[PDB]
Structure 1
């Protein structure tokens, strides 16, 4: 809220919020993870050979993990699923060949009745690349237009230069600050 003062904030919301990173592998969770600083460094395994990370920040929780068809599932992802209160989808702007893969994963994920009331956000990571897709083309490409209006928002960014990352969270914070 404050952090070295800087500027008087107004965020007073706290109606349960837990932002997790969902999407295709290599989308840019590694770069974004470091950006979040990583509150409580926790390393656990749901089953067989699945690597999941969990961190806690005061009240807001955060969890990162990849997803895909070839990927399996268990009962650990479900437990945290409902408990989760923040759904943020991040795809690769330079991986068009897999953009559909991200859409499908998002399609099945968004079909969770327990997540029907969760805030959904899309982030494009790799806008610094000269051959990277734009949020507009990405939005239409991933069928972002196919989803009802209000569910999620889309924004292009570059994980390397940090351009778009700050404005993306700041904006997201406002939406989370004003609850209907």
Structure 2
């Protein structure tokens, strides 16, 4: 299974990936580029493309769209200023023809932080209810603990 994981910078995309691959919480640098890794979960081998979220790189995601079976969209639940921006990025991503049938999994992340928005709140802000054309799911996660990560891999594998 081919997976594209994106989201704004600092959402926790690489932390998620290497928690999944190494069972370890690594010390990230901003990703100017991608990381690509293969992860085994329950007889599925997920090839995850973690593509950096800062602006220059954001402009490049479209090259990773093609062949994508599922999309992990990571959100920093503690950052309320950038939630609209996330909504804007994700909405036009939903309009992409190469992403047309891909399974849509939102991770509301850093759920560990006291003022993190809830997954329900995030669902309203991102406009997730309005997707009728394909599968979507939202999952509260904490990438450092590992909470919600495998519930994500589970949902994804049931595409």
**What range describes the TM-score normalised by the shorter chain of this pair?**
0.7 to 0.9
Distance 2:32 2:105 in 1: 30
Deviations along 1:70-97, one digit per CA (max 9) or x if unpaired, are 7247997444321222211111110111
Q: 1:39 to 1:76 in 2, by over 3 A?
A: farther
Shift of 1:64: 6.3
**What's the TM-score, normalizing by structure 2?**
0.73
Q: 1:82 to 1:75 in 2, by over 3 A?
A: farther
Distance 1:41 1:158 in 2: 11
Q: 1:40 to 1:141 in 2, by over 3 A?
A: closer
> In 2, are the aligned partners of 1:46 and 1:74 still within 8 Å (CA)?
no
2:21 to 37, 43, 49: 37
Q: 1:94 to 1:75 in 2, by over 3 A?
A: closer
* Cα RMSD for the two superposed structures: 4.9
**What's the TM-score, normalizing by structure 1?**
0.66
> In 2, are the aligned partners of 1:21 and 1:63 still within 8 Å (CA)?
no
Distance 1:157 1:40 in 2: 16
Farther off after superposition, 161-170 or 37-46:
37-46
> In 1, are the aligned partners of 2:39 and 2:45 still within 8 Å (CA)?
yes
Shift of 1:173: 1.9
Q: Are 2:86 and 1:125 equivalent residues in the alignment?
A: no
Question: Where do 5+ consecutive residues of structure 2 fail to align?
Answer: none
Deviations along 1:153-177, one digit per CA (max 9) or x if unpaired, are 1111111221222222223223xxx
Question: Where do 5+ consecutive residues of structure 1 fail to align?
Answer: 1-16, 175-179
Count of aligned positions:
159
Distance 2:155 2:33 in 1: 36
State the structure with more CA Rg: 1
Shift of 1:31: 1.2
Q: 1:80 to 1:160 in 2, by over 3 A?
A: closer
Deviations along 1:88-114, one digit per CA (max 9) or x if unpaired, are 111111011111111111111111112
> In 2, are the aligned partners of 1:27 and 1:91 still within 8 Å (CA)?
yes
Distance 1:106 1:139 in 2: 12
